[PDB]
Amino acid sequence: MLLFCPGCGNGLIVEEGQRCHRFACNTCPYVHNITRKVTNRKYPKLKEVDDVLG
Amino acid sequence: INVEIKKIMKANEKVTSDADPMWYLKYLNIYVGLPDVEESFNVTRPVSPHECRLRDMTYSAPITVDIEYTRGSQRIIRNALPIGRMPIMLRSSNCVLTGKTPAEFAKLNECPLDPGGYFIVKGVEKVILIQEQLSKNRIIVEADRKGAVGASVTSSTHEKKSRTNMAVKQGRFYLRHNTLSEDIPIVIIFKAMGVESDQEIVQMIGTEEHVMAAFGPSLEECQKAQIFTQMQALKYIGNKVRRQKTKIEEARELLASTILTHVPVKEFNFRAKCIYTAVMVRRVILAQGDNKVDDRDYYGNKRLELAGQLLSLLFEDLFKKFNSEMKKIADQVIPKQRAAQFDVVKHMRQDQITNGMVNAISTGNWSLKRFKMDRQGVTQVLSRLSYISALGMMTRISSQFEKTRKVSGPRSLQPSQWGMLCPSDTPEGEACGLVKNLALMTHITTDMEDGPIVKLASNLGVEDVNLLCGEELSYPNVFLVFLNGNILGVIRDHKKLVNTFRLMRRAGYINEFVSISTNLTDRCVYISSDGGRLCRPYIIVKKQKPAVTNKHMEELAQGYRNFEDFLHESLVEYLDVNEENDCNIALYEHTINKDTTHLEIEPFTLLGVCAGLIPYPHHNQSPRNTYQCAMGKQAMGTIGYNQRNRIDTLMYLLAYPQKPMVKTKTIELIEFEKLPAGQNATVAVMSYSGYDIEDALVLNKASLDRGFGRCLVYKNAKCTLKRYTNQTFDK
Amino acid sequence: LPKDVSVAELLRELSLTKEEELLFLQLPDTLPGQPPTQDIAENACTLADLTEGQVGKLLIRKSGRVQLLLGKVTLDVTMGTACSFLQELVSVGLGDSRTGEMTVLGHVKHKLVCSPDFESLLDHK
Amino acid sequence: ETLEALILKELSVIRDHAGSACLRELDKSNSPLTMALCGSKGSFINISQMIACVGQQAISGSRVPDGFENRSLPHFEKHSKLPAAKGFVANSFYSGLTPTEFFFHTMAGREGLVDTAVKTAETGYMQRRLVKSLEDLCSQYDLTVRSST
Amino acid sequence: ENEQVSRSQQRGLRRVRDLCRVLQLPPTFEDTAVAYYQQAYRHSGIRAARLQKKEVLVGCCVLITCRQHNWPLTMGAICTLLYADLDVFSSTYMQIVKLLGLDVPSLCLAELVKTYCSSF
Amino acid sequence: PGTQMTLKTFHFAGVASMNITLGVPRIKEIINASKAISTPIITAQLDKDDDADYARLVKGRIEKTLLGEISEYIEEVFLPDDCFILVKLSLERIRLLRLEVNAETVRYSICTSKLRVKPGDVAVHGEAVVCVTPRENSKSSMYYVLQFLKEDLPKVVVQGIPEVSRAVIHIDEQSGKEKYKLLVEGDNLRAVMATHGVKGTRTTSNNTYEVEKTLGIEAARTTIINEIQYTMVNHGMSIDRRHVMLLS
Amino acid sequence: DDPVVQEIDVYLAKSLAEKLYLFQYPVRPASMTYDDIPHLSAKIKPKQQKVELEMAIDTLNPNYCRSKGEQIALNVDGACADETSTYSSKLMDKQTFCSSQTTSNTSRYAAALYRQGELHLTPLHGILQLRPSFSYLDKADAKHREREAANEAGDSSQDEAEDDVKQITVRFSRPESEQARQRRVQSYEFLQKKHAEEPWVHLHYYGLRDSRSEHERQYLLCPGSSGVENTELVKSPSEYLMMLMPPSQPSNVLSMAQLRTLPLADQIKILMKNVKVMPFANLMSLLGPSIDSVAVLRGIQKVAMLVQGNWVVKSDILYPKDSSSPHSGVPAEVLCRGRDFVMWKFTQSRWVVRKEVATVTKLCAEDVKDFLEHMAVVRINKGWEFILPYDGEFIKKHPDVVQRQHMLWTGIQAKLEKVYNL
Amino acid sequence: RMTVGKLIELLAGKAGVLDGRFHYGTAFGGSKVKDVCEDLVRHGYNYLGKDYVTSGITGEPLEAYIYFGPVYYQKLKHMVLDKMHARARGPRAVLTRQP
Amino acid sequence: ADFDGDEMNLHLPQTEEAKAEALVLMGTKANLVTPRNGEPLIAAIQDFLT
RNA sequence: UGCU
Numbered sequence A: 001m002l003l004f005c006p007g008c009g010n011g012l013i014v015e016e017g018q019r020c021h022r023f024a025c026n027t028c029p030y031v032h033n034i035t036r037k038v039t040n041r042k043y044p045k046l047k048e049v050d051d052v053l054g
Numbered sequence B: 001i002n003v004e005i006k007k008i009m010k011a012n013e014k015v016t017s018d019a020d021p022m023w024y025l026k027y028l029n030i031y032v033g034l035p036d037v038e039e040s041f042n043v044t045r046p047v048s049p050h051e052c053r054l055r056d057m058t059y060s061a062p063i064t065v066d067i068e069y070t071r072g073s074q075r076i077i078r079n080a081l082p083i084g085r086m087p088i089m090l091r092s093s094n095c096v097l098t099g100k101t102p103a104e105f106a107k108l109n110e111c112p113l114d115p116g117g118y119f120i121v122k123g124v125e126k127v128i129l130i131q132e133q134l135s136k137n138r139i140i141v142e143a144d145r146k147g148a149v150g151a152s153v154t155s156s157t158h159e160k161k162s163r164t165n166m167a168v169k170q171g172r173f174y175l176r177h178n179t180l181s182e183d184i185p186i187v188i189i190f191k192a193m194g195v196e197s198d199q200e201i202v203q204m205i206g207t208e209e210h211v212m213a214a215f216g217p218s219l220e221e222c223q224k225a226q227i228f229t230q231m232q233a234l235k236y237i238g239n240k241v242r243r244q245k246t247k248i249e250e251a252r253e254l255l256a257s258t259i260l261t262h263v264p265v266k267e268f269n270f271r272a273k274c275i276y277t278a279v280m281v282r283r284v285i286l287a288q289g290d291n292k293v294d295d296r297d298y299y300g301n302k303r304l305e306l307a308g309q310l311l312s313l314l315f316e317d318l319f320k321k322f323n324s325e326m327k328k329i330a331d332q333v334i335p336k337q338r339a340a341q342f343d344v345v346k347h348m349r350q351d352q353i354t355n356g357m358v359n360a361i362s363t364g365n366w367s368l369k370r371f372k373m374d375r376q377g378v379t380q381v382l383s384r385l386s387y388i389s390a391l392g393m394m395t396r397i398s399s400q401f402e403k404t405r406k407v408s409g410p411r412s413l414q415p416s417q418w419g420m421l422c423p424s425d426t427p428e429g430e431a432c433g434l435v436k437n438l439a440l441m442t443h444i445t446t447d448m449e450d451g452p453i454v455k456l457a458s459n460l461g462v463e464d465v466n467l468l469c470g471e472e473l474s475y476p477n478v479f480l481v482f483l484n485g486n487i488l489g490v491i492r493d494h495k496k497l498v499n500t501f502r503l504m505r506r507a508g509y510i511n512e513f514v515s516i517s518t519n520l521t522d523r524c525v526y527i528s529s530d531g532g533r534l535c536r537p538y539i540i541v542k543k544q545k546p547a548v549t550n551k552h553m554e555e556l557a558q559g560y561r562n563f564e565d566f567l568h569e570s571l572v573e574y575l576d577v578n579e580e581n582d583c584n585i586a587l588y589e590h591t592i593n594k595d596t597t598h599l600e601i602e603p604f605t606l607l608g609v610c611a612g613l614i615p616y617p618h619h620n621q622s623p624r625n626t627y628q629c630a631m632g633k634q635a636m637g638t639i640g641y642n643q644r645n646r647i648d649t650l651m652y653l654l655a656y657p658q659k660p661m662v663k664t665k666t667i668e669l670i671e672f673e674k675l676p677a678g679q680n681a682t683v684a685v686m687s688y689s690g691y692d693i694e695d696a697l698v699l700n701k702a703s704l705d706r707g708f709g710r711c712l713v714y715k716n717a718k719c720t721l722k723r724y725t726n727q728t729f730d731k
Numbered sequence C: 001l002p003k004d005v006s007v008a009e010l011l012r013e014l015s016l017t018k019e020e021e022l023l024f025l026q027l028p029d030t031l032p033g034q035p036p037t038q039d040i041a042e043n044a045c046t047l048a049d050l051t052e053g054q055v056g057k058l059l060i061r062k063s064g065r066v067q068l069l070l071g072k073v074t075l076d077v078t079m080g081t082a083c084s085f086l087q088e089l090v091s092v093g094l095g096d097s098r099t100g101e102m103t104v105l106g107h108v109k110h111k112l113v114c115s116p117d118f119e120s121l122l123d124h125k
Numbered sequence D: 001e002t003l004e005a006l007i008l009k010e011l012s013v014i015r016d017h018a019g020s021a022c023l024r025e026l027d028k029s030n031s032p033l034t035m036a037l038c039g040s041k042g043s044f045i046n047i048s049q050m051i052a053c054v055g056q057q058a059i060s061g062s063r064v065p066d067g068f069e070n071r072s073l074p075h076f077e078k079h080s081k082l083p084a085a086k087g088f089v090a091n092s093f094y095s096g097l098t099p100t101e102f103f104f105h106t107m108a109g110r111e112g113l114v115d116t117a118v119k120t121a122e123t124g125y126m127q128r129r130l131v132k133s134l135e136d137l138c139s140q141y142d143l144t145v146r147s148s149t
Numbered sequence E: 001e002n003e004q005v006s007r008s009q010q011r012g013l014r015r016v017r018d019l020c021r022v023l024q025l026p027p028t029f030e031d032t033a034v035a036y037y038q039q040a041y042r043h044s045g046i047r048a049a050r051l052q053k054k055e056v057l058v059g060c061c062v063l064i065t066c067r068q069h070n071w072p073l074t075m076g077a078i079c080t081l082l083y084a085d086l087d088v089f090s091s092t093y094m095q096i097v098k099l100l101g102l103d104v105p106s107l108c109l110a111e112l113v114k115t116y117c118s119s120f
Numbered sequence F: 001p002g003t004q005m006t007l008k009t010f011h012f013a014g015v016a017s018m019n020i021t022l023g024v025p026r027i028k029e030i031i032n033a034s035k036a037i038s039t040p041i042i043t044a045q046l047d048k049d050d051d052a053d054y055a056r057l058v059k060g061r062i063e064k065t066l067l068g069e070i071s072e073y074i075e076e077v078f079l080p081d082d083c084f085i086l087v088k089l090s091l092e093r094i095r096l097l098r099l100e101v102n103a104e105t106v107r108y109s110i111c112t113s114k115l116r117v118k119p120g121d122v123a124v125h126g127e128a129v130v131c132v133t134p135r136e137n138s139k140s141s142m143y144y145v146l147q148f149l150k151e152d153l154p155k156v157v158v159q160g161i162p163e164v165s166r167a168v169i170h171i172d173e174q175s176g177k178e179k180y181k182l183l184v185e186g187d188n189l190r191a192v193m194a195t196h197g198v199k200g201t202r203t204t205s206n207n208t209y210e211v212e213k214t215l216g217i218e219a220a221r222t223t224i225i226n227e228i229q230y231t232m233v234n235h236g237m238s239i240d241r242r243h244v245m246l247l248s
Numbered sequence G: 001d002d003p004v005v006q007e008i009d010v011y012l013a014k015s016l017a018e019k020l021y022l023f024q025y026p027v028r029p030a031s032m033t034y035d036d037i038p039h040l041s042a043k044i045k046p047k048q049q050k051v052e053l054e055m056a057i058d059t060l061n062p063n064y065c066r067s068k069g070e071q072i073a074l075n076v077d078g079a080c081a082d083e084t085s086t087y088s089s090k091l092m093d094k095q096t097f098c099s100s101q102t103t104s105n106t107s108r109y110a111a112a113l114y115r116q117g118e119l120h121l122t123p124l125h126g127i128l129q130l131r132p133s134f135s136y137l138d139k140a141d142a143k144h145r146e147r148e149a150a151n152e153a154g155d156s157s158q159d160e161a162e163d164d165v166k167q168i169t170v171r172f173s174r175p176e177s178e179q180a181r182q183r184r185v186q187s188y189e190f191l192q193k194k195h196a197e198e199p200w201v202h203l204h205y206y207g208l209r210d211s212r213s214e215h216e217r218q219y220l221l222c223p224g225s226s227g228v229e230n231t232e233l234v235k236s237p238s239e240y241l242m243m244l245m246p247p248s249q250p251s252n253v254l255s256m257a258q259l260r261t262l263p264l265a266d267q268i269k270i271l272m273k274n275v276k277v278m279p280f281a282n283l284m285s286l287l288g289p290s291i292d293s294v295a296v297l298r299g300i301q302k303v304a305m306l307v308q309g310n311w312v313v314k315s316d317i318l319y320p321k322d323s324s325s326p327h328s329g330v331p332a333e334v335l336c337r338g339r340d341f342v343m344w345k346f347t348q349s350r351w352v353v354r355k356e357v358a359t360v361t362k363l364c365a366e367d368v369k370d371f372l373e374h375m376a377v378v379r380i381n382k383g384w385e386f387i388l389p390y391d392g393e394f395i396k397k398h399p400d401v402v403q404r405q406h407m408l409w410t411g412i413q414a415k416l417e418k419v420y421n422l
Numbered sequence H: 001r002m003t004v005g006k007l008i009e010l011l012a013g014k015a016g017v018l019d020g021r022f023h024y025g026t027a028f029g030g031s032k033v034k035d036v037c038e039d040l041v042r043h044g045y046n047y048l049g050k051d052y053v054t055s056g057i058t059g060e061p062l063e064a065y066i067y068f069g070p071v072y073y074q075k076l077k078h079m080v081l082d083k084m085h086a087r088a089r090g091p092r093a094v095l096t097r098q099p
Numbered sequence I: 001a002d003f004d005g006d007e008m009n010l011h012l013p014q015t016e017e018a019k020a021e022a023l024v025l026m027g028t029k030a031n032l033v034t035p036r037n038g039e040p041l042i043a044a045i046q047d048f049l050t
Numbered sequence J: 001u002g003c004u
């Protein structure tokens, strides 16, 4: 998903620190370590069975 | 000639030169006067339009003005000084034909039934056709050349007109302007316009999952670069700005004034412009899914420029040119001529405006450099083939395309032409679909002050857009309200707003020509108050019963009330295309159901003037009606009661014209029965002698001998005996 | 979160609970009154010209109608834009020309809009 | 699209049945019927349109598109896919066409006119190119078609 | 032509045209005025003359062109719009008419009467 | 005949879909012999024209199938040890469409013209689970490339010809027997003929350039003649075959 | 729908009218508040309100990167300069929130404090939106620029004494044209300098948890009785409507409203000129019941005549002295005489012969047709009949008016017999 | 061409010239066919416009009735006298020596 | 053509060889059929078929 | 600008 920094509001990118992967900002020292599993499903629309024509 | 010329004079009231300060030329009041002729030796004399046609001169009035200037620091004023000549339209306010009885028309050698409304220059009759163009200050979402669904906006103010586009060629929004070297991402422009928080930018764009998924690439591309502040974004824009920190100042000036001129900024406050571009990006994102592409042929987004606006623009341009020439002459004369103090009166050109107007009306090509407008075919020779021909040509409409491509889109008949333009009336040939005629019952709106409209909108609870963030724009119940392309604000429960606005307009506190429309797909309520919009009267229907009754019709017939009284009593109201898009209309009384808001006045009014001559047109085919209108535009018959004194290069008259037996109400209205263009003959439908194989007919020798079909062709041969430079003359 | 209505909001704020709440209402530009001895003209009459005390009543009729009787006329109160971001109401009192005090009175959650009942104003006369 | 096709099929069936009924009820010695039979001019389709009922006004091989928002004309309800609201002409030329039917017929006529106008220029250019390309070949005496070279 | 012309002659021609357009005289009058101005400029005595001399030359050429077509125009208004005094105007007019010898039709009384009556 | 033709519509050739340009524009495209034409049509015959199962099988074999069209969900999971993208293939839809695509085929399809993803980055854990773990390429790219992967991964081809865009099963209901054939809206006849189960001996295409490049100049001439004749017959007007033969 | 319950009262407070501001954070959701964030100071201005909040953020928390804090501190500030530092320590400790002005006037906005049975309204002096400003990045850019300049200067180990004496480059204070002066005034730099010219004011922060918050929260209330009749706010709905919507500033051009706004005499004259045939009762109904019947009678007797109980407009009213016949061009006196003769014939007999009228008046067919259509209709086998029936009610009600009209018609008949020699 | 409107106009004109009236051909309205048929049957003419006509050449009656009636014909400006052209050697153009 | 105002051109050859070639090759009796498919174009028309 |  798209996450933002509560301090400034800029976009957060996933990087690797010295202990664990974390979300961090490119304009401030704010970080957020990942504790549990985080997922972002999209459920792409499957291709339906195109039936015969005629 | 009454208000716009005065406004232009007030705008250009003062003109002065840089050299020799304390010198100025101030205009006080401009007059047009009555039509006069400069034939006599420095003497004016009233001249009639027929006399102008006979003498091959122009029917214009002397433009006069009162001015005040400083010759040698002593203020000298002039109460009346001619500066030009404006061709006076026939049957106008200042024309000699208006307010005249048929006896006075006969005395002046003019037909009472003549439609008028055309200019007479050098003896030829020219008519300024109505131009049809796209509405300005409106976002248009459409596919690009290759097929990229993008958006465009042509912001046109009183000074400049700039078209800026936005494309999604590479999944991200790039904004393109004529003043930028290369299209830049929209996020950089967001950061440059004050809003630097990516969270706020995303909230303004939208809070929907698909919206964020589509806008993610733009955020990633912006984060790839080191642009995070307004200063850096402005520096990048200035680096990308073409030649006409200095770059930062130029970028800020372009963002504030050049880009989106229609969106005003109080004092470098780009909040409104940020909201506007956010709404545009949201519309683009919504269109990127379901193919809800707006169409250009929808006449609800069309504007009709009458001759008044064209003449106003031309007069403004000519006055600006005259002021510039006067300033140049002053700068060249005052500093080095002599101790004799210089004044403008010795160089006030009185033929510049006259020649400019004459050329622009005669040649028909209009070249306004201040607006970069190069139009052709604006004026056309009034076809005097018949009275019907002249009346149908007077109400023609030309398009902005002017036969550029065989698109077939604008040439096709759109459903938006209901009650506004004649569906069947169209010239047969290469101009099929581009030249159209107005309906029998329609009107063109003018420009309003827009003051009380804004006041009522603000009082009705419309929240300020600057008070709240853009996140409220993504709510389903929050509807945006726009005013002539400018974001007026937001509102909730737009039904109450629309109902109250319509009730106020019917009451009369708001001009009846101000249109209000609501689009639910985009959740936008548009309030239109600009001129050129097409409107049509409709009877108000409330609770399955029209407001107009038999008592009201009897009062109108007896003369107790009029159409203005009907408008004031909330009985009949004007509806625009965008307004009827949402309102429900009923053709007849039996068709009225529970969900009806208006009633059609008359169905036969859908046809135009040329189509009104067709007897029982709903029983024939559409190409038959088109060909009938095309041939009636050339039908032979009487022109007017002054056809004998009229002298044209080519005229066709009928010996024994007879009015039709099957005459239409449109015929009775246009008074065509008084000037018929045909004869009724005892025709027998049969095959005889095989000389009527393919569309041919057989005439009777005795009938033709007894005067049937007798026609008269009148031609003019003109000769001139002018005097050359030398004292010699043609004899 | 279903969209609430002003009548139910007031009902749940008064009967269901008794805790006070800070509201933000948007009044029309001109109030149905005259500036009392304010040196005029039919100009705008805002709250800055009115005095303290009872100025109007809030009525809640059946079917969810919420009206505001501010004299001879009656406005209608509706729910404004549902703001979800933080709104802190503060009073910045500059008691001294060199130092002042910023006092956070509370938080703003709901927004109201008061509009003239133009239909009634038109059908009255 | 399935609903559109079903409605078009129903309208075509109605038109065909009306035409058949008109042809069966019409007596001999009728001038339009005789002309359609001999093939000089007209046809059963035109006879049924001008006597029994006009067919569905098809624009680009489809019903009348929604010019306004979610509807062709304001006189019909929004999201209404009725035949009379989408282009069907119940009345005939003899009984007279309603304003909406006449407007749809004019739309179809103007579409045909602009199509023919474009076709004229397109085929003129195509024929010019084809002739300028094929004007070099000729039949020789040895039964071999050869170019100019 | 139009290349072997000095800036002074060009300024004189432009002044002739400006005064003609201010007085709203027809293009035939403008052509006659410029032709007479060129004919007068052919002489050297008028060619190398005063600035006031050439201004009065412009005025007198306009006056002669106006007279040649039986058009009434008062020399008072000519001097008023020409930035000149009557004394030098008449002196230079006499000099130029003696140097040229062009036809000088008399000012008709009725035309001047009509022109002045239209003023009231 | 260009003037005689009215440029009609609704002529779907009996399939009620697949709008094909026919008439004067089609004649113009044919006489111009452009390399890329609008709406190309390839008609291919089947060895087993009566088995709908085999027809669907060859349709899936020839038609391009993207990863996002078969995968039920793609999630970028950031476990405390590592971040990677997990793709879950819908085996039910796979067996319903009769596509011979499994986890191994998906893994082989990945790492092909996709920012040079090494084989070790992609791994398979379950029967229908694909785990992709990218690495920083140091070319103005960091670990935050999972967004670009999410953007361009669902549009990767796992089975079928990349040029083929849409293949449909047309049926001929002749009273003798009902047979099946493949109608492909692509611009690759060589691949369609090379695919298994397609009778390449009776495969025709509308793109004259492709027919020339694939089966020779004589096949191109025959295809041009047949296409012109069919386009002319569609409008009800007939022309002697000698004219089109001479033109070709 | 009646007000069954919830009859809440509304009170007004003016204690904090000029001291109440509305601060909103567009980027901070309502769930998380700044109550726990220790504030430091706030810069504000009395005029051109633009408040800048200076707060402090924690560092020992796990949501802070110490290495990146050191990096940003070393980028924004020097190594150990510390004369003008955006942070006291070597870490990003202070955060800057800048305010943006929403609207110039906030008189229409008011804060409503709700209590049990009453709602107190307090005006707002200003509404500002607080957003995290980025000025440390600009200061870091300036620091980098000056560092690059220092590096360029110190490119050599020992820099010799540069003879870069500042020559007297005193440019002209050239007289700026009006257009260029207006451009300079409207430039952003001029506005920024004008805003900066005003001195700043430093204010302390008192959070909601402080006792001062609850101490000052009571000022939003006002001491007053429950029921007090306001002296103001007593204008009628019509007056309120006029206040909220102030004004901007053929012969039937005037509408009904424009007619009614005219005096009674002009109203009657215009109505007669338009209709030319109307009963007295219809005229009263059109004019309104509030107008006196005697007044209407006086108005109509001067512009109309009595014909078979009905009122017909006079001929001179329709045909002024300077007008003429639109069909033949004859003077208006002849038209008036003909119309008077027609009216006399109608008064004498209900049936009038067009041929006889034409033969007597010597007028043209079109004029006779116009005169007959103005006050009558065509009846087959009977000629022309008066459009309205015989109204005996008015005749019985007003006998003196009937006698006056009878003597006037006798005089008109005498004049007609003298003129046309009947 | 399906020009039933021409037949309706002819019938209305015949009825009007018979009864001394002016029928209206207003779009989506006007005089109906029943009214003109009643007028024709009252005046003694056929209710369908077709009348018994005798051939003028052979003098014998026609097997089919002819549809007579007054129709409003209008002449156009297109005249054969003006459109007739015949070019001899004549003049040529200066640039290219062609007509 | 349809005899509804069509203007047609008429040319007179100025050479015997051209006249003979026009009469033979462009003869109406010899061009009764079109080379497109051999169908006859010069045949009966309206008012003749009926 | 009109015509087929």
Ligand SMILES: *[C@@]1(O)[C@@H](COP(=O)(O)OP(=O)(O)OP(=O)(O)O)O[C@@H](n2cnc3c(=O)[nH]c(N)nc32)[C@@H]1O
Pocket (backbone or CB within 6 Å): B377, B380, J001
């Ligand atoms: C007509 O309104 C305009 C349009 O003419 P254009 O086709 O734009 O003129 P053009 O582009 O320059 O055409 P071309 O290149 O072939 O010469 O012009 C007037 N008009 C144009 N052509 C004619 C004409 O042939 N005859 C008449 N009478 N008017 C013409 C029209 O006003």
Ligand SMILES: [Mg+2]
Pocket (backbone or CB within 6 Å): I001, I002, I003, I004, I005, I006, J004
């Ligand atoms: Mg033809």
Ligand SMILES: [Zn+2]
Pocket (backbone or CB within 6 Å): A005, A006, A007, A008, A009, A010, A025, A026, A027, A028, A030
């Ligand atoms: Zn951050």
